[PDB]
Design a protein that fits this description.
The structure is cut from a larger assembly and holds chains A (about 45 residues), B (about 45 residues), C (about 80 residues) and D (about 70 residues). Chain A is mainly alpha-helical. Chain A is about 75% helix and about 0% strand. The longest helix of chain A is centred in the middle third of the chain and has 34 residues, at about 10-45. Chain A is rod-shaped and about 60 Å long. Chain C has about 80 residues and is an all-alpha fold. Chain C contains three helices and no strands. Classes of the chains: A mainly alpha (about 45), B mainly alpha (about 45), C mainly alpha (about 80), D mainly alpha (about 70). The interface between C and D is medium-sized, with 21 and 15 residues. The PDB classes it as transcription. Keywords: Mediator complex, RNA polymerase II, tfiih, Pre-initiation complex, transcription. Human Mediator with RNA Polymerase II Pre-initiation complex.
Chain lengths: ~45, ~45, ~80, ~70
C-alpha cells in the first residue's frame, strides 16, 4: 500500500471522472428509453 | 379530409424523433483525438 | 483540449503505460524473506472491515502490562504440523 | 481492495488510463456526433424558411458555449 502511495492522488480523480462520463453516456441512453414511453404516454396525457 | 393525414404525419414524425436518438448515441464518427479503436470499445464508421 | 496534459497526467502515462506488470502483488513479496502465499481470499478483507468500527480500539492504546507478559517465557520443545 | 485480495493496483492505473482515454472519446465523440447534427440541421432550417433566416443564425449562436 505504501509503495503504491505515489498514485494516491490521481486514481480517485479518474475514477469519478470516468463514472461521470459513463453517467452522462448511459444517462442519455436511460434518458432516450424514457422518451419512447413519453412519445406515447405524453401523447396520451395531452 | 386533409387534417386527418396531418395527425398521421405529426405522429409519424413523433415516431421518427425517438428513432433519431436511437442511432446517434451508441454510434458516432471514430475521431482520432483519443485513438479509441485500439482497445475495448466497439467500432462504427462515420 | 488534451485533458491528459491539461491536468498534468502525462507523467502518469509515462510511468504506467503498456509494460510488464504482474497480475498479483509479486513485485514486493520477493523483497521480503520467507515463502509468502498470496492471501487473497474473502477472509483477508478484514482490514476493510476494521475501518467501519474504529471504536473497537480506544483513542490511544489498549491497557498494557509488561509484567503480565511473563507468559512469553518459553520452554525448549519441538513443534509438529509446522514447517519453517 | 486490490491490495486486500493481492490484486494488481498498478494494472488499475493502466485500467484508469485506458478508462479516461476511451471515455474522453465518448464525451467528445458524443459531442461531435451531436454537434454535426446541430450544424447540419441548423443549415437545413436555413434553406426552408426565407422569412426567418436571421433567427436560425441565432440558434447556432446560442447553441455554442459562449
Amino acid at each position: 500500500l505504501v509503495k503504491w502511495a505515489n498514485n494516491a492522488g490521481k486514481v480517485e480523480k479518474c475514477a469519478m471522472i470516468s463514472s461521470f462520463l459513463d453517467q452522462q453516456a448511459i444517462l442519455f441512453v436511460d434518458t432516450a428509453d424514457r422518451l419512447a414511453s413519453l412519445a406515447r404516454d405524453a401523447l396520451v396525457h395531452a | 379530409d386533409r387534417l386527418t393525414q396531418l395527425q398521421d404525419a405529426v405522429n409519424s414524425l413523433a415516431d421518427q424523433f425517438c428513432n433519431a436518438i436511437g442511432v446517434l448515441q451508441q454510434c458516432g464518427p471514430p475521431a482520432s483525438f483519443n485513438n479509441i479503436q485500439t482497445a475495448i470499445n466497439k467500432d462504427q464508421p462515420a | 483540449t488534451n485533458l491528459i496534459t491539461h491536468y498534468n497526467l502525462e507523467q502518469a502515462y509515462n510511468k504506467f503505460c503498456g509494460k510488464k506488470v504482474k497480475e498479483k502483488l509479486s513485485n514486493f513479496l520477493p523483497d521480503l524473506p520467507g515463502m509468502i502465499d498470496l492471501p487473497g481470499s474473502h477472509d483477508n478483507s478484514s482490514l476493510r472491515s476494521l475501518i467501519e468500527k474504529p471504536p473497537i480500539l480506544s483513542s490511544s492504546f489498549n491497557p498494557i502490562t509488561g509484567t503480565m507478559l511473563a507468559g512469553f517465557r518459553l520452554h525448549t520443545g519441538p513443534l509438529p504440523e509446522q514447517c519453517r | 481492495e486490490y491490495i486486500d485480495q493481492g490484486r494488481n493496483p498498478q494494472l488499475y492505473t493502466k485500467e484508469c488510463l485506458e478508462r479516461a482515454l476511451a471515455k474522453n472519446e465518448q464525451v467528445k465523440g458524443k459531442i461531435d456526433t451531436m454537434k454535426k447534427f446541430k450544424s447540419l440541421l441548423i443549415q437545413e432550417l436555413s434553406k426552408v424558411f426565407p422569412e426567418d433566416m436571421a433567427k436560425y443564425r441565432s440558434i447556432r449562436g446560442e447553441d455554442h458555449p459562449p
